[PDB]
């Protein structure tokens, strides 16, 4: 039949995919250090012989919202949030390094510093931070310097042991990977530490998802979705009527 049936179907299909991207945003409102995902549609025309009447649209992710997340003051010593722009460099389960903004850190039984996702926290030597096992008081600095008190030591024996690797690259050069870690679009790009990134210890950075912004985008995808499915029915209606040209 007419190709407008599939031209509208290819549009309704993308609206559902855009709806899925907004659904993931609202599910992650309470998530810690979550960067909102933007949804956009690209107009692609079928170039060739004939009148230029058919143009497809596909939904794609143009970028992410890198605005500062909601800061939650918790009073916990091992809670860190990046003041302004900046990232925390961590290595995932496989070992590939990446940037994260979740500062819900913790100390394991061996002293290795991890975050809430389990990623190991990189240090001054581009290696995971391993603090002494018998600690007494962890006091993270504003610049990322970790000053710990050995167990049984006097309060005046406060010494720095490591400095968290904070990286502030261009946000437009970062893409979210398959596990929520932002990495460089260009492969084999070294993550260079920055001396301007600051860590506000004792607070946790929340999500930056604008709940109303997603809701008002939802009510427009539904209407656009319903208009296209009416086009599918009216293209079906036209073909059924034209079925009476072979009756003879």
């Amino acid at each position: 039949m007419d190709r407008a049936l599939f031209l509208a179907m290819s549009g309704a299909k993308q609206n559902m995919q855009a709806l899925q991207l907004r659904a993931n945003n609202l599910a992650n409102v309470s998530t810690t250090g979550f960067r909102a995902d933007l949804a956009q549609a690209r107009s692609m025309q079928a170039y060739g012989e004939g009148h230029p009447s058919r143009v497809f649209s596909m939904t794609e992710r143009p970028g992410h919202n890198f605005a500062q997340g909601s800061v939650i003051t918790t009073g916990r010593d091992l809670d860190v949030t990046i003041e302004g722009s900046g990232w925390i460099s961590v290595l995932d389960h496989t070992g590939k390094e990446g940037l994260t903004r979740n500062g819900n850190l913790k100390v394991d039984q061996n002293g290795m510093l991890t975050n809430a996702s389990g990623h190991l926290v990189l240090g001054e030597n581009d290696a995971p931070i391993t603090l002494p096992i018998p600690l007494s008081k962890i006091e993270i600095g504003r610049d990322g310097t970790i000053s710990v008190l050995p167990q049984g030591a006097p309060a005046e024996e406060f010494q720095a042991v490591d400095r968290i690797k904070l990286v502030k690259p261009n946000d437009q050069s970062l893409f979210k990977d398959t596990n929520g870690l932002f990495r460089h679009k260009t492969p084999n790009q070294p993550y260079e530490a920055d001396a301007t990134v600051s860590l506000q210890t004792g607070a946790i950075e929340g999500s930056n998802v604008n709940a109303v912004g997603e809701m008002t985008a939802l009510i427009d995808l539904q209407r656009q979705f319903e208009m296209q499915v009416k086009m599918m029915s009216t293209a079906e209606e036209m073909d059924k009527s034209s079925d009476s040209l072979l009756r003879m």
Binding site: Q45, Y47, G48, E49, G50, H51, P52
Partner: peptide, 24 residues
Amino acid sequence: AGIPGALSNQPPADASIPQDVAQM
């Protein structure tokens, strides 16, 4: 001729004048 602002279905090339449209 007819309409003055008709489009062209050929992909942009910027080097060849589109002959798909009635270029007169």
